[PDB]
Amino acid sequence: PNITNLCPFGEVFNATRFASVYAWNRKRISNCVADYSVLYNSASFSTFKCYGVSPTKLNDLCFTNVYADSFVIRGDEVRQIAPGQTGTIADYNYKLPDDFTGCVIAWNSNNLDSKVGGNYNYLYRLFRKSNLKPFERDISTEIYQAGSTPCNGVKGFNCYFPLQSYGFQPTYGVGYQPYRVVVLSFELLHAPATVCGPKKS
Amino acid sequence: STIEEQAKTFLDKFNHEAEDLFYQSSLASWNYNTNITEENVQNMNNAGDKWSAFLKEQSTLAQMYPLQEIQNLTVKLQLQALQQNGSSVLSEDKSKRLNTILNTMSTIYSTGKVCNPDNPQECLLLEPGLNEIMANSLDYNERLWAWESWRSEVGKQLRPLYEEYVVLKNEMARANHYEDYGDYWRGDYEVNGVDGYDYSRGQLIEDVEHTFEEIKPLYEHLHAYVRAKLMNAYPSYISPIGCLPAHLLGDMWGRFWTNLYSLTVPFGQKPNIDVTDAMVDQAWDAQRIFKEAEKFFVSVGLPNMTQGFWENSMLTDPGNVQKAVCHPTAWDLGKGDFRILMCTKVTMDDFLTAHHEMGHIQYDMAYAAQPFLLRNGANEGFHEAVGEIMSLSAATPKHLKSIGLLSPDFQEDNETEINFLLKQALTIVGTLPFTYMLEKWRWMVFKGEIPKDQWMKKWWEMKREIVGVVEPVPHDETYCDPASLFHVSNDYSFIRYYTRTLYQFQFQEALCQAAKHEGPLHKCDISNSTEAGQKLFNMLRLGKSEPWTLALENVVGAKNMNVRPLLNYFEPLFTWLKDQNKNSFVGWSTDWSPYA
Ligand SMILES: *[C@@H]1O[C@H](CO)[C@@H](O[C@@H]2O[C@H](CO)[C@@H](O)[C@H](O)[C@H]2NC(C)=O)[C@H](O)[C@H]1NC(C)=O
Ligand SMILES: *[C@@H]1O[C@H](CO)[C@@H](O[C@@H]2O[C@H](CO)[C@@H](O)[C@H](O)[C@H]2NC(C)=O)[C@H](O)[C@H]1NC(C)=O
Ligand SMILES: *[C@@H]1O[C@H](CO)[C@@H](O[C@@H]2O[C@H](CO)[C@@H](O)[C@H](O)[C@H]2NC(C)=O)[C@H](O)[C@H]1NC(C)=O
Ligand SMILES: *[C@@H]1O[C@H](CO)[C@@H](O[C@@H]2O[C@H](CO)[C@@H](O)[C@H](O)[C@H]2NC(C)=O)[C@H](O)[C@H]1NC(C)=O
Ligand SMILES: *[C@@H]1O[C@H](CO)[C@@H](O[C@@H]2O[C@H](CO)[C@@H](O)[C@H](O)[C@H]2NC(C)=O)[C@H](O)[C@H]1NC(C)=O
Ligand SMILES: *[C@@H]1O[C@H](CO)[C@@H](O)[C@H](O)[C@H]1NC(C)=O
Numbered sequence: 001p002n003i004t005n006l007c008p009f010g011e012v013f014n015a016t017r018f019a020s021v022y023a024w025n026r027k028r029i030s031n032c033v034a035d036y037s038v039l040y041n042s043a044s045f046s047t048f049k050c051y052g053v054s055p056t057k058l059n060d061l062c063f064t065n066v067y068a069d070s071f072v073i074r075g076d077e078v079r080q081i082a083p084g085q086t087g088t089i090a091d092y093n094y095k096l097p098d099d100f101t102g103c104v105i106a107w108n109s110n111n112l113d114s115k116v117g118g119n120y121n122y123l124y125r126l127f128r129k130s131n132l133k134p135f136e137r138d139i140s141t142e143i144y145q146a147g148s149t150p151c152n153g154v155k156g157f158n159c160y161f162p163l164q165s166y167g168f169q170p171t172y173g174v175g176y177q178p179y180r181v182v183v184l185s186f187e188l189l190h191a192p193a194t195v196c197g198p199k200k201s
Numbered sequence: 202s203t204i205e206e207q208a209k210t211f212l213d214k215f216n217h218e219a220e221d222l223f224y225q226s227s228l229a230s231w232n233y234n235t236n237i238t239e240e241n242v243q244n245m246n247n248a249g250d251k252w253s254a255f256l257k258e259q260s261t262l263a264q265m266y267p268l269q270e271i272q273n274l275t276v277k278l279q280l281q282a283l284q285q286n287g288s289s290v291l292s293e294d295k296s297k298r299l300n301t302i303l304n305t306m307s308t309i310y311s312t313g314k315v316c317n318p319d320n321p322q323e324c325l326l327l328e329p330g331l332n333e334i335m336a337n338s339l340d341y342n343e344r345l346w347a348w349e350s351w352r353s354e355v356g357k358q359l360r361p362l363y364e365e366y367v368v369l370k371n372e373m374a375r376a377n378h379y380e381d382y383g384d385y386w387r388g389d390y391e392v393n394g395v396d397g398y399d400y401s402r403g404q405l406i407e408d409v410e411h412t413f414e415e416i417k418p419l420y421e422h423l424h425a426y427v428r429a430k431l432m433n434a435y436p437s438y439i440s441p442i443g444c445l446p447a448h449l450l451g452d453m454w455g456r457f458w459t460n461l462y463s464l465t466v467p468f469g470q471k472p473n474i475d476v477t478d479a480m481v482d483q484a485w486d487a488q489r490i491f492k493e494a495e496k497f498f499v500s501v502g503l504p505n506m507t508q509g510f511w512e513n514s515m516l517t518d519p520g521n522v523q524k525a526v527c528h529p530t531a532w533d534l535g536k537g538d539f540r541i542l543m544c545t546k547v548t549m550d551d552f553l554t555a556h557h558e559m560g561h562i563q564y565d566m567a568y569a570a571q572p573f574l575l576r577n578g579a580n581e582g583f584h585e586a587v588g589e590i591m592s593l594s595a596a597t598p599k600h601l602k603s604i605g606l607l608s609p610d611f612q613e614d615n616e617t618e619i620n621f622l623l624k625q626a627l628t629i630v631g632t633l634p635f636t637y638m639l640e641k642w643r644w645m646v647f648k649g650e651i652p653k654d655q656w657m658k659k660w661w662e663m664k665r666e667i668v669g670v671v672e673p674v675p676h677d678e679t680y681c682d683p684a685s686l687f688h689v690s691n692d693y694s695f696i697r698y699y700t701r702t703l704y705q706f707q708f709q710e711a712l713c714q715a716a717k718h719e720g721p722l723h724k725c726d727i728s729n730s731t732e733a734g735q736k737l738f739n740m741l742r743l744g745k746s747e748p749w750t751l752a753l754e755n756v757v758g759a760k761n762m763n764v765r766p767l768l769n770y771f772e773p774l775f776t777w778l779k780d781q782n783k784n785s786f787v788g789w790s791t792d793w794s795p796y797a
């Protein structure tokens with residue numbers, strides 16, 4: 001029949017505001033029809049990389065549900081969103097498994113997130129005892145203890161606040177300007193498939 | 202507990218705050234400089250001091266990690282810079298007195314006023330005016346009058362202040378485990394890391410005159426030729442056997458001999474290379490100059506300028522009430538922000554200055570990947586030398602003819618080459634003895650070798666011995682002539698300008714050798730040469746991470762600092778001067794004085 005009940009990609013890629021990287025926003029897409037042709041043919045995306053499957057064949061195969069993870073990161077920090085990568089983001093904020101299948105889209109948003117006086121509403125974690133397992137979120141704000149002296153929830157000689165804020169401004173050069181990132185991860189649990197592409201007529 | 206692993210976290214925490222605080226301070230400074238107004242002043246200060254306050258607190262933390270247990274060379278080097286106490290080692294009473302004395306010296310230096318006796322109601326300043334009196338004029342009495350007035354009405358009150366300043370700064374330096382204040386200034390030319398690249402503070406002193414005795418044969422012939430020309434210009438005023446007076450050089454202090462080119466031109470009929478008329482005829486605006494400058498670095502192989510430099514930077518025309526300072530500067534605000542500040546006009550000098558500033562910007566962009574505390578040159582002589590290389594390589598007739606700025610049928614011969622080489626020699630090689638003498642005198646007075654009474658008599662008796670300049674009028678002890686200079690009362694080191702000149706020519710010769718060029722060195726060009734662009738880029742990107750001894754190994758063959766290329770650059774000039782002053786005396790005798 002006619003293509004109907006389209007998945008709500010509008011409310012994900014055209015949201016008013018995005019969450020911070022240490023608290024990336026996860027949305028579940030199921031029981032609808034997805035059109036990746038408009039996403040692929042759009043020229044607004046600076047980075048569009050698909051690892052598990054070829055982008056041209058997306059409309060053919062279809063899975064049971066999709067997860068969209070949205071956040072905002074730096075410019076040169078985009079390359080860390082890839083399997084088998086190391087860094088401050090890939091170890092403390094967002095980790096992808098080596099067998100990851102899906103796609104990553106990233107586009108510049110310097111005209112929205114940046115503010116002349118400095119936008120301090122975006123935060124990221126800088127210190128943590130251990131690395132993150134794939135697809136794990138941590139929102140704790142407990143004081144990190146680098147040394148051996150205990151801290152009673154107060155910063156000091158060897159105790160630091162884990163979270164640090166970005167300083168986005170319009171005059172920042174390329175590689176420091178804000179970039180909005182959406183990661184699509186497809187799950188293939190043995191339940192009947194629901195998220196399937198449109199049948200061309 | 203461990204100290205090596207828990208210092209990396211402290212450094213990482215420090216860098217995050219330092220980057221954005223420094224960016225805000227630099228942005229405020231740029232906003233003030235571009236738009237001079239009352240409102241944009243306090244804000245700048247409201248950032249500045251705050252930034253300084255930060256560098257206080259972190260320093261107090263840096264002392265808590267001992268430096269005898271860190272094994273990583275990079276971490277130890279980065280932490281060593283933060284561990285310096287600075288001037289915060291003395292008591293508050295002495296520190297405030299030092300700050301007050303520095304401020305009052307700086308204010309007194311920039312408030313010069315001298316009125317001539319006949320009309321005591323008109324004084325002049327160091328700005329154009331009194332400076333112009335002995336910059337472009339042919340007279341003996343007025344130049345001497347201006348010299349004596351400036352050195353007896355501005356330099357006679359700095360002596361009591363400098364006398365206490367020297368001892369106070371020496372005590373401050375001794376409180377930091379340095380034997381004197383000389384080692385504090387020489388500490389930047391010191392590395393104690395990689396074996397075989399070791400350098401010491403005291404080695405530079407022995408290394409300065411060892412590379413200076415090879416220049417005396419070249420300097421003596423230039424001195425003799427200049428003296429002969431001055432005799433031909435000024436009759437019965439300069440003895441042929443002796444040397445030349447002090448106020449006839451062409452500047453306030455004789456730092457440069459450029460103003461003397463008009464009197465001592467080799468050939469008068471042959472004109473110089475001037476393309477300003479061609480610049481105007483072809484209608485070259487200010488954007489074209491910077492586009493041509495960009496084309497040079499693109500052709501060499503260096504990366505292209507980022508978009509945003511053409512947008513944020515104030516390239517030209519302050520124009521209306523939107524006032525600005527016209528001092529050409531290159532700004533690295535951080536976070537990938539590079540800008541330029543210039544009042545560009547249609548002149549070859551502006552072309553060369555644009556090339557110079559573009560080279561500075563390229564060097565700043567080279568080491569952007571280093572940590573915050575390592576985003577600087579290896580020493581103070583590399584940055585300006587890299588800046589001057591581009592100016593050196595962009596003035597050759599071949600480059601001008603290639604860009605369609607000179608007639609293709611140009612017929613350069615002996616005369617123009619000799620004229621241009623002499624013009625460059627009057628500026629480059631004519632300033633080394635002055636810098637060497639000044640730095641030697643400052644080091645000796647800081648070390649305490651010369652007592653208080655032996656201040657004004659050693660200075661002149663080494664000026665006559667090294668430079669060959671006599672005092673027009675006897676100066677007793679109560680004068681403080683050396684303090685009458687910009688980099689003597691503002692607490693600035695002066696040895697940078699000596700090593701920079703040698704580094705410039707070493708780099709130029711190395712590039713010309715690794716550019717497949719045959720012929721004299723003064724006609725060499727590094728344009729269109731990709732292989733010459735990589736060799737430079739291997740040392741630009743190191744920054745302060747590696748010792749400067751290793752930095753002088755990816756460009757030149759040897760790690761030492763020897764003046765080989767200068768003696769080869771002015772080879773035709775030397776061989777012409779050998780046959781020119783044949784019927785004259787080469788040398789000076791320190792017995793003849795103008796007053797007696
Ligand atoms: C977000 O909204 C914009 C609306 O401006 C969508 O842009 C579409 O594609 C082009 C872009 O100018 C135009 O035809 C229209 O503006 C939009 N509609 C159509 C039918 O093309 C953009 O696709 C939206 N983002 C999504 C859906 O992810
Ligand atoms: C000092 O510490 C730095 C920072 O860790 C080390 O630099 C790293 O060296 C490894 C060696 O392969 C590289 O893979 C990394 O890319 C380097 N940078 C970083 C940020 O890790 C340096 O090797 C250490 N020096 C020593 C141990 O002598
Ligand atoms: C910088 O100043 C600090 C503060 O005085 C100096 O630290 C002192 O060093 C002496 C000699 O080792 C000790 O006896 C004191 O106990 C230290 N004081 C403190 C508060 O630690 C330091 O030596 C100075 N010089 C540096 C850091 O190079
Ligand atoms: C810097 O110069 C390089 C080399 O010219 C530019 O790279 C290409 O330049 C040509 C001609 O200008 C363009 O047609 C290409 O589109 C450029 N390629 C790319 C990937 O940009 C480069 O664009 C220049 N950079 C800037 C900021 O002007
Ligand atoms: C090497 O230098 C020559 C000399 O200018 C360059 O040749 C010019 O090339 C432009 C087009 O690129 C022509 O319009 C000029 O007529 C050429 N001039 C001459 C004298 O032939 C050449 O482009 C340079 N090579 C590189 C790689 O930049
Ligand atoms: C599909 O669209 C066509 C054209 O608008 C229409 O005639 C047809 O009834 C539609 N099919 C359904 C099932 O609504």
Ligand SMILES: *[C@@H]1O[C@H](CO)[C@@H](O)[C@H](O)[C@H]1NC(C)=O
Pocket residue numbers: 236238239240241523
């Ligand atoms: C310069 O500063 C004045 C006063 O602060 C202000 O009125 C003016 O708009 C500024 N100009 C620019 C270009 O920022």
Ligand SMILES: *[C@@H]1O[C@H](CO)[C@@H](O)[C@H](O)[C@H]1NC(C)=O
Pocket residue numbers: 614615616
């Ligand atoms: C240049 O110098 C050589 C060497 O003496 C001489 O033979 C030649 O005539 C000179 N040319 C000109 C144009 O002066």
